[PDB]
Assembly symmetry: C3
Homo-oligomer: 149 residues x 3
């Protein structure tokens, strides 16, 4: 009995695990996730960078990062407004790095940006036409999280 | 070993409960839930009050209740049309109460409403402009449920 | 302990099954699923017919099939642009069948369609106006999956 009951329960658990994964797939699909493409999502709430990082981390994601023009366009279409990107030069001025580590491989700065304006701007937002502008991390912009392809 | 397998099962169940809660958190977020705010959802189906209340209940929610102007605006935007609110005066005519308890505090009544028109109107709907009107609970309005903050 | 823990685990698994069921109901509702009606979902990605079939099967759904004018309109609203239907005449040229088997019980063919134009057209797409046109299965159309009522 015992061993049989246990084996049966292990079978149910694995079935439930598959069932949850299906739920996750269907959710992503319904939200527009494209096949083999990163899933970007927003609640359309504007908050300071620290909060954005906190929120995405809590959802086990990361602040959205465009690796190329294709992803930059996808992020733009999702936010529909100015949104923080997972890129900052907080650690070392002038040297932008992804919040997940690494230096920039792709950028789409606006005319005369980055300018580290005034007191200093260490964060980055994707604005009009998907162009970038560095801004104060304390400002409040749309939170856009990223999930695996 | 039976105990090793049992210990693994506890870990599997725990891992699963955590993943399921993450799936719930991501869904809410993707549905527009703002941090520390209750969120509203609708399938855009029109139905009499009894069915909205029942439906929201089986989803572990409640028929939408605007506790203030911000929330009133949030419900209006989600609903897009006339929707039932979780407010009625079925228990004592003239005394509006929340479906979950308590006397109505914040209100956004239209001019000359509530009027318990004709044979009577005990339910409440939020109309296109966000104002409220009391109506028959048998009328079919959009089903909007709210889930805790 | 062993038998007590084993019994509790059974209770834990059943509780999780109920929770996931609920998560599934809430998601369907959030996506506009109406009571007693099938629901169609799309990520708005264009792909060849074989890919749509593969994707819907992976979501445990089927490629969208309109059984009447109501569902035909429903699918059209969801897709927003030309999408594949789960109908093809791949088995026997001229004999359109559901991907789920059987002859069509309802059709909305545009004038002089289906015509197996040129090199051949064995798949079907619901155009922007709801009418049907048979087209090449290799063309990229919007993926719309169907789930039961
Ligand atoms: C003079 O005051 C107005 O008189 C109208 C005619 O009696 C009222 O409208 C009627 O309301 C009926 C509801 O009992 C019914 O409406 S329903 O179909 O929407 O249920 C009648 O068809 C309708 O003519 C009017 O009531 C207000 O507008 C109605 C459309 C309805 O929304 C009511 O709930 C409103 O109170 C009434 N207006 C006022 C301000 O007294
Ligand atoms: C019922 O099974 C399916 O029948 C279809 C109709 O015959 C097959 O498609 C046809 O395949 C032909 C070659 O066999 C030819 O395609 S080709 O030009 O690419 O050669 C016809 O134009 C085409 O309509 C279908 O075959 C499969 O799909 C084809 C598009 C092609 O990729 C073939 O290699 C495939 O086998 C066939 N499906 C299967 C799974 O056999
Ligand atoms: C007012 C300043 O204008 C310029 C921008 O690049 C800066 O970010 C700042 O907004
Ligand atoms: C351009 C061609 O026109 C004709 C149609 O029957 C074909 O499906 C195709 O659309
Ligand atoms: Ca700096
Ligand atoms: Ca800087
Ligand atoms: Ca700047
Ligand atoms: Ca009354
Ligand atoms: Ca009166
Ligand atoms: Ca009344
Ligand atoms: Ca009234
Ligand atoms: Ca053919
Ligand atoms: Ca051919
Ligand atoms: Ca054909
Ligand atoms: Ca054709
Ligand atoms: Cl800064
Ligand atoms: Cl009533
Ligand atoms: Cl074809
Ligand atoms: Zn979902």
């Amino acid at each position: 009995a015992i061993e049989v009951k246990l084996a049966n329960m292990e079978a149910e658990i694995n079935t439930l695990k598959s069932k949850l994964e299906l739920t996750n797939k269907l959710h992503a699909f319904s939200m527009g996730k494209k096949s083999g493409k990163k899933f970007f999502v927003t609640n359309h709430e504007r908050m300071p960078f620290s909060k954005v990082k906190a929120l995405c981390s809590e959802l086990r994601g990361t602040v959205a990062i465009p690796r190329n023009a294709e992803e930059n366009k996808a992020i733009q279409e999702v936010a529909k407004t100015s949104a923080f990107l997972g890129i900052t030069d907080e650690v070392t001025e002038g040297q932008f790095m992804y919040v997940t580590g690494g230096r920039l491989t792709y950028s789409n700065w606006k005319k005369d940006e980055p300018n580290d304006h005034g007191s200093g701007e260490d964060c980055v937002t994707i604005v009009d036409n998907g162009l970038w502008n560095d801004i104060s991390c304390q400002k409040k912009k749309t939170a856009v999280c990223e999930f695996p392809a």
